[PDB]
Design a binder for this molecule. Structure first.
Ligand SMILES: Nc1ncnc2c1ncn2[C@@H]1O[C@H](COP(=O)(O)OP(=O)(O)O)[C@@H](O)[C@H]1O
Ligand SMILES: Nc1nc(=O)[nH]cc1C#CCNS(=O)(=O)C1CC1
Length: 283
């Protein structure tokens, strides 16, 4: 049998850099929300103990792909504690709608979906905490997808507190530039002193993203898309770029603005979801 699993995107509704730990990573205060929209992963069970990503993802080698890395990490952890039935294997393909590397957390969502899926399919019996713990080794975006709820995240993004923001409609645009997350986070002028505030203070202050100023200042493609969308609705950067989103109260308004968007926006519309489509699909 073949099972299909959603791999939704995420938005950083806000994002503030509160410092940098010794290991190079930054401590932040951010708010994750999912989009009812993203990739679709299909898994066929194997009995020979192999893991095969059948559909290749452009620019990623098989063993470098987060799908495979999450699959082998799960395999190793389960076999190291006798939770992997003999011969556990899987064929994995992916219908990818999400851009590679745009701050939508696609790859990180792909890893979380594989972990939760294969954990159910192999009957490893691992817990949310264990899965989210393994996901952190793969990336700081991964835990939020593993736990499956919109959340106020701190630390490096793994300290998650479930919260239910309004499920606005979003026009999500991808500027035609690739922004390596290292470039933004290594920039000197990036704010790393934003004061740690309470959720209630953050929920009433104006939402912003501390990385937007650098991304805007260094990539005119990101500046172009931002200037265009801000004429219509509140628009901000998500993650470290390059993607940008604008908030709309209704689907018609959002889609109307997308009908007018020049093609260089590379934009789609999607409703926000406080419950991850993946976890919605596990009930
Ligand atoms: N299945 C995958 N899909 C997308 N990116 C992947 C995948 N596996 C590994 N990656 C890596 O992650 C990067 C893309 O980042 P991604 O998480 O998709 O966007 P962002 O994290 O900027 O929102 C690429 O450098 C690529 O090597
Ligand atoms: N804390 C970090 N320090 C770094 O040096 N690199 C990456 C970090 C992270 C994170 C969690 N995901 S995220 O979407 O909120 C943010 C990446 C935009």
């Amino acid at each position: 049998m073949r099972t299909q699993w959603p791999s939704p995107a995420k938005l950083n509704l806000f994002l503030y850099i509160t410092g940098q730990r010794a290991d190079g990573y930054h401590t932040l205060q951010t708010l994750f929300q999912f989009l009812d929209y993203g990739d679709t992963i299909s898994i066929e069970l194997r009995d020979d103990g192999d893991i095969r990503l059948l559909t290749p993802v452009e620019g990623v080698e098989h063993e470098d792909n987060l799908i495979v890395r999450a699959a082998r990490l799960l395999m190793k952890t389960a076999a190291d504690s006798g939770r992997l039935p003999t011969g556990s294997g899987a064929n994995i393909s992916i219908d990818k709608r999400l851009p590679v590397g745009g701050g939508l957390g696609g790859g990180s969502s792909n890893a979380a979906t594989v972990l939760v899926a294969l954990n159910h399919l192999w009957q490893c019996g691992l817990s949310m905490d264990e899965l989210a713990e393994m996901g952190l080794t793969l990336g700081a975006d991964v835990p939020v997808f593993v736990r499956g709820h919109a959340a106020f995240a701190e630390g490096v993004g793994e300290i998650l507190t479930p919260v239910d923001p309004p499920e606005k409609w979003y026009l999500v645009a991808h500027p035609g530039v690739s922004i390596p997350t290292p470039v933004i986070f290594k920039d000197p002028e990036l704010p790393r002193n934003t004061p740690k505030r309470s959720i209630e203070t953050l929920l009433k202050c104006e939402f912003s993203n501390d990385c937007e100023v650098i991304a805007r200042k260094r990539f005119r493609e990101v500046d172009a898309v931002l200037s265009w969308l801000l004429e219509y609705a509140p628009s901000r950067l998500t993650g470290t770029g390059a993607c940008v989103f604008a908030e709309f109260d209704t689907e018609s308004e959002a889609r109307q603005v997308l009908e007018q968007a020049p093609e260089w926006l590379n934009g789609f519309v999607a409703k926000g979801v406080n419950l991850s489509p993946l976890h919605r699909a596990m009930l």
